[PDB]
Amino acid sequence: SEHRKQPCPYGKKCTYGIKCRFFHPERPS
Numbered sequence: 001s002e003h004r005k006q007p008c009p010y011g012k013k014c015t016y017g018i019k020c021r022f023f024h025p026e027r028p029s
């Protein structure tokens with residue numbers, strides 16, 4: 001439900017980092 005509302009699911013822990021589909025706190029996606 002919060003695909004764009006909330007930030008990435010992990011963000012800092014996320015493995016994608018730059019290749020993430022969600023919105024990051026420091027990166028765009």
Ligand SMILES: [Zn+2]
Binds near residue numbers: 015
């Ligand atoms: Zn991410």
